[PDB]
Amino acid sequence: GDTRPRFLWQLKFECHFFNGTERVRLLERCIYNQEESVRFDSDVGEYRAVTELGRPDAEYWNSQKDLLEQRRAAVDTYCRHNYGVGESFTVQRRVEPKVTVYPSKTQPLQHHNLLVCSVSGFYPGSIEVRWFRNGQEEKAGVVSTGLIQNGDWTFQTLVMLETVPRSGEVYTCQVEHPSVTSPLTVEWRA
Amino acid sequence: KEEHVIIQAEFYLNPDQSGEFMFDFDGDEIFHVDMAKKETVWRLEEFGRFASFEAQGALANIAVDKANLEIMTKRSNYTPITNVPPEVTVLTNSPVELREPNVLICFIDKFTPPVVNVTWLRNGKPVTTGVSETVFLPREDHLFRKFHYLPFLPSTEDVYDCRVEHWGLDEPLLKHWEFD
């Protein structure tokens, strides 16, 4: 059995982009186990200890003007540069969602049922899903799974509507996403 | 608000002597550096035809991370990390239709340290054909995420489980899935 204690060290450089690359913030951070110890915030301009363990390092790294200067320009030489390098396949990546509608469990009419609107394989995550009953939007009884990131640059989400289907009713799932100009719609007739 | 985030994340773990170097875009992995083959591995093949990255730089960074971990361990007075067991969820990547190729996704989330053993089981027996997985993805709370995949052919005859082993768990965890 393995019970030996573990020691973890993490280093993260996070580039935050606002309004394209008009506004950029760089956040450099070191985490001992699960505790951030020291960081460099481009908005601050120098290293700052977060915990007592990072005191020595912030004082040390801040004493090297060379490091500070390089770090203060990383917002341009690093952040903006990488944004440009990957823009075409990341920032601009677009994959259309596949929309399917089906009732949860096959039950006879006039009985409570959960209508499932499955939206999958899309990218980016920004998406809007709405349910309509005979042309009118149903804002209540909507059970959403939320955004699910599949780990392969694809998302999925299941938005269910609580209903009591009655013959003649037409239920429509409407989906808006950056990959399509007009919203996608799939109808299910009771 | 905020439109995008790119993250260069790396770690080194003792005594396992495990390291990792990767780039992340809005929660998705752009690429990571294979420590054994010392090469850049793109999450999606096409990424490599649009950009490049010298794996060497990553290897040099890891050497420093290893050295910093040593220093910090002693400085913390050998304070070990507290294991945080993972949340595990199994889903298909699309609505399942009998006899239609699909993929089972084992989502392992919110855990640390970044060490797990995952195996797929079909009717109780390990399966390896076509399986793949991601490296450890970073989280804002500094815990990790990891995905395991299993291509399969849906049927009413088979049952699957994602078996996950982690030090934060008292016993191996099995997440079940079967056609309903």
Partner: peptide
């Protein structure tokens, strides 16, 4: 185009 990486600095002694 190539990705640039930020180099890690060694901690205090």
């Amino acid at each position: 185009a190539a990705y640039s990486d930020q180099a890690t600095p060694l901690l205090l002694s």
